[PDB]
Design a protein around this ligand. Structure first.
Ligand code: NOJ
Ligand code: NOJ
Ligand code: NOJ
Ligand code: NOJ
Ligand code: CA
Ligand code: CA
Ligand code: CA
Ligand code: CA
Lengths: 686, 686
């Protein structure tokens, strides 16, 4: 099937995501509305249920509101049954309208709909070529107090109606009981509770298996993507075994939320995007885009530096989900802010690298502060706003122009207020020019592009005051004045003769899994896929066509491989690196080491004989291990994804700067479980 | 030996070449000076001999003039015996002072020195770590008139004293007798005479073998590089067999001259750089640098487009020889024009990609128009000009900082008069800021670089009004004013932990030849070199150290290969592409096809079964063939380098866009000569 197909659940760069708070979009079925204290039909108390549901989204796909805008994927609230309690927090009543307070991950939230309503939403979305992404929040169940078991539903977890347990009297340790986080360390934020939310214990085998069975059920119902809540707050080794469960079963595009503030660049955030098996909401993009287009706290050089820097720091930049606002920030459009600012920031996001997400109601110029005020019901379904038309004109280019979906980003002209950038993929080109200054025109002289000679018409049709671009010989444009607030997009597409890989999904899986390689120029006849120097041909290539190849991962040793395609004529593609072949299915094992005393800046790590443990390489060792909450120094601990059902060999080490101190003695051995978790508890061998 | 060693004859990106017109630099031996009418000791008449010789160049290496400037390679006038005639062109007397009128390619020009002086020059240069490049001009001998055999020496060619023949009564057909070129087409400029120079006929086996024995003789005398004259004027297929003779024998850096005018971008020029086996004087760079820093006929946006476009169009941009003026251009500095223009442009060239060449006397601010006025005797040997000091501070960086020798070029800040670019190779960084505006300071706000946080001294120590750069977190530099005319260079080096290939030489040779791979991070232990998927290890790697590997080309089929290095730990490098493995030694064969009538825009091409003939691929066929001068339409002809001593199969095809029309019949076979040339004259087969 081609790369742009709705059946491509693995890669979303050709898509535009519309993020819906299900309760706040459309009430298509009033019979499923919560009653009494839990419901507010006027939606003026934004902490209560207003009535929006899966039938309302079906109705808006059907009548052309969503499809008219060019949307090709929707991201909805977590679908699972939530608690029914109305919680009073300091006067204000609060309900689970947002879908984040789960009680049963195997059932639906009936305010949103039934299992049949969910099936009908999947089938309507697919019939209209829209992919469906669901939130999934495996970190916690709901607000709970173990001291007061009558508060809310005491964080209770059920498995298809069957009670597994609550927070009070948790004799099975389904939950963490360490108090609440103060967010001081990443360790602190993982094992302590977020606010009053009952923290699930993923080291408990019943919790691990339950959540893995639950995600497979939603994959069996046809979902096409997953957005994981609070990835900063769950053990990264458990989330890698969770991603291996998805990828080795039915791989679908998965991304998480790790919040970053203005000007925060975090190593851990970039490591997580690069090594977890999921991508991230691109807060680095979003925060700089709001500084340049909204708050004017940075200029075009800051935007350029973010695009140039992120291209390097994210191993797969085409998988990162970009946005200009969402449920965790003030709405981009403000009361006293010019609407052209929103329109430009949307045109920039839709033409930039990554997978663009638009927060519902952006096209209706909704304004509002932070939660709950950024989640008002959307006030209108007018299809004639400039913002609606901006998305309607640009969002189809992700499907039709491979340069927009996959290309490189090249700054061609810049000054403090103007950027002109080019996206390029093979011979496909798009050029975007943005003047954020609203009172001064920009004189553009000396613009060179990769466009062939011609008079290119602005894809926006002059609605954001764009103009035609005349390109002569050598891609040189004739000079022009870009209007105050001007935004224009120019493009050229052709068929590629060289194979070029634009995206690969999934990025981590065991031998025998089919991955999806998307791009252009592969040709019609089956050629060769290289995983390192290993060639895969014939029957192992499950499908081959010019924009997409599906191929089985060869039985190569676990490790990181470069992927390369050669078409039937032997012409080879660019290399798409950082593919992780797993040793096999994964389980999370907690490694605990006692009596590992360290100096200042010296930390304990783990390594061993499988790729999952760094293959005995100190530079790739697992850690630094943790040593504050579940166990305290000099005992260190860490939850690590490792191959299931096999005897691994390992050793601990201390590292400080360039010095590695290994444990002495014989190498340690451990036979991992086939599913569930296990704990290894040992003592430092000098 | 390391990449920066004087013994690395294959790659010159760590060098700075100083171009010397031997007669116009230093007369170190007055006893070898031409006498009488051929000589002007005062060098007032710039068309006569002034006395400069190889002993004068030895004296300027030994007294510290050249070594003090940081020069690491000299490029001198053609060393071979020239005609002795004083030619009178319309009253003006003229001699071979420039070395371009050869009469014997196997002897030295006596005015420059004996064989002994040449060997002493090689040894003195090498002892002082200077490489030696010679001109070689195999397109012609000298001014000749077949009608008047008494004019000049009638272009006579000798072979070590034995007359091979002259232009009048050329019964052996050593020369072309088609008249002079009008430069209307490439074909016209190849087979007709340049002005009155007796054009050699490379399809004559005596000429072919003589010129290849002559070059081999000079490689045996120890020369380190060859600059070939008039590459646009010899058959490209003969030039490729000549380059293969060099590269399969004693590979040295070879580059040619193909003139480009202002704003001229030629596809044939780039195709020759990429496919001939030699690189080129980078006229594209030179013309744009002059437009921006000398003439003001373009601004920094055009310089940016030149850097960014040349990156892509040259398959190996690190091998192109850059410059701002030379023997075929008016001097960059004008009579009492602003010296800071020259000083900024030299700084620009010394810190940019490729191999920089400085024309002698640039450090003495010599001015003058076109030939012979740009070749005056240099007027001073002062070592205290600002220009001498600029070369001295920046030239060593090509040896010490691999980002300047090999790195990418990245514009980081720009406006009409200011460019700030960054060179990067691994984590080595150099950042250059240039304000060409001589009256307006520039406030640089928003500069982001790859430099670590800290303060950086301008490497030029303020001599071109540069300043200290303070870099904070994120590579963001503090706001500073770049003075009018300000140029500053800031850098950071640190050792490469992983393999990075910066250059490969030669780029075209047969199996068994040793090639030189230069870069950083290869480590001291032998690793693996890949030519495609063919791993080469052990005894086939002739030498391996951290900055340089020498390895023998494996016995793979002829074709274009990617080269990649993996150090002993298995970390792999970037891919260096476009390496051509030849099928074997090369001979040039003339292919002639008669009765090949074509339509509007339909042309004849040759293809065949060796890689040299495109391997039957019509998109890789040799052509379009020629049909004007040696043979006339509908007879087409072409001189093609093919493997020597074997039976090749071939066919002709006609192409008009995408329609390929083949000859009928069984494929033609020919057994190529082992040495010399051959002609295949054949009839179109329907
Ligand atoms: O704090 C990050 C994450 N924690 C849990 C909250 O329920 C969720 O909405 C939030 O986005
Ligand atoms: O000597 C202890 C430690 N040293 C280095 C070896 O690679 C590793 O296998 C061993 O466990
Ligand atoms: O083609 C330019 C070139 N032509 C050939 C001439 O010999 C040389 O003097 C001149 O520089
Ligand atoms: O297709 C015509 C020509 N092409 C290439 C084939 O190898 C040769 O055998 C054939 O005659
Ligand atoms: Ca409802
Ligand atoms: Ca947690
Ligand atoms: Ca002399
Ligand atoms: Ca010629």
């Amino acid at each position: 099937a081609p790369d742009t197909s709705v059946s491509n659940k693995q890669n979303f760069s050709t898509d535009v995501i519309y993020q819906i708070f299900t309760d706040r979009f459309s009430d298509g079925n009033p019979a499923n509305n919560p009653t009494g204290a839990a419901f507010d039909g006027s939606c003026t108390n934004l902490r209560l249920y207003c009535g929006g549901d899966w039938q309302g989204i079906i109705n808006k796909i059907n009548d052309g509101y969503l499809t008219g805008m060019g949307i090709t994927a929707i991201w909805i609230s977590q679908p699972v049954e939530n608690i029914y309690s109305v919680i009073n927090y300091s006067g204000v009543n609060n309900t689970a309208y947002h879908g984040y307070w789960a009680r049963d991950f195997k059932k639906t939230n009936p305010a949103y709909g039934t299992m049949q309503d969910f099936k009908n939403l999947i089938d309507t979305a697919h019939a209209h070529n829209i992919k469906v992404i669901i939130d999934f929040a495996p970190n916690h169940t709901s607000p709970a107090s173990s001291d007061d078991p009558s508060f809310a539903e005491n964080g209770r977890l059920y498995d298809n109606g069957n009670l597994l347990g609550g927070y009070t009297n948790d004799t099975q340790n389904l939950f963490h009981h360490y108090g609440g986080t103060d967010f001081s360390t990443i360790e602190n934020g993982i094992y302590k509770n977020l606010y009053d939310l009952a923290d699930l214990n993923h080291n408990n085998s019943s919790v691990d298996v339950y959540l893995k069975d639950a995600i497979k059920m939603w994959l069996d119902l046809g979902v096409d993507g997953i957005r994981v809540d609070a990835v900063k707050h769950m053990p990264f080794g458990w989330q890698k075994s969770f991603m291996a469960t998805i990828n080795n079963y039915k791989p679908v595009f998965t991304f998480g939320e790790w919040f970053l503030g203005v000007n925060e660049i975090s190593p851990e955030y970039h490591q997580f995007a690069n090594e977890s098996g999921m991508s991230l909401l691109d807060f680095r993009f979003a925060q700089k885009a709001r500084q340049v287009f909204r708050d004017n706290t940075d200029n075009m050089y800051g935007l350029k530096a973010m695009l140039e820097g992120s291209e390097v720091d994210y191993a797969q930049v085409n998988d990162q989900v970009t946005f200009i606002d969402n449920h965790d920030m003030e709405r981009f459009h403000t009361s006293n802010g010019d609407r052209r600012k929103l329109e430009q920031a949307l045109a920039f996001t839709l033409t930039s690298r990554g997978v663009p997400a638009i927060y519902y109601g952006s096209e209706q110029y909704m304004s509002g502060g932070n939660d709950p005020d950024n989640r008002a019901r959307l006030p209108s379904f007018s299809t004639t706003t400039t913002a609606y038309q901006v998305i309607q004109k640009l969002a189809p280019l992700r499907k039709s122009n491979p340069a927009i979906a996959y290309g490189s980003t090249h700054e061609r002209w810049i000054n403090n207020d103007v950027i002109i950038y080019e996206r390029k993929f093979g011979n496909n080109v798009a050029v975007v020019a943005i003047n954020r200054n609203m009172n001064t025109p920009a004189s553009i002289t000396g613009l060179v592009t990769s466009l062939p000679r011609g008079s290119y018409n602005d894809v926006l049709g002059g609605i954001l005051n764009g103009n035609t671009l005349t390109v002569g010989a050598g891609g040189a444009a004739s000079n022009f004045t870009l209007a105050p607030g001007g935004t224009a997009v120019w493009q050229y597409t052709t068929d590629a003769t060289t194979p070029i890989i634009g995206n690969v999904g999934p990025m981590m899986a065991k031998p025998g899994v089919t991955i999806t390689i998307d791009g252009r120029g592969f040709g019609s006849g089956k050629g060769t896929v290289y995983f390192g120097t290993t060639a895969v041909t014939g029957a192992d290539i499950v499908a081959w066509e010019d924009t997409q190849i599906q191929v089985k991962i060869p039985a190569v040793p676990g490790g990181i491989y470069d992927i390369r395609v050669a078409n039937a004529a032997g012409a080879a593609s660019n290399i798409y690196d950082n593919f992780e072949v797993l040793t096999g299915d994964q389980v999370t094992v907690r490694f605990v080491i006692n009596n590992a005393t360290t100096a200042l800046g010296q930390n304990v790590f783990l390594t061993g004989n499988v790729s999952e443990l760094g293959n005995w390489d100190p530079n790739n060792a697992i850690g630094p291990m943790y040593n504050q909450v579940v166990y305290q120094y000099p005992t260190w601990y860490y939850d690590v994804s490792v191959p299931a059902g096999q005897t691994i060999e390992f050793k601990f080490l201390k590292k400080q700067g360039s010095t590695v101190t290994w444990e002495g003695g014989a190498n340690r051995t451990f036979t991992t479980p086939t599913s569930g978790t296990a704990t290894v508890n040992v003592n430092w061998q000098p």
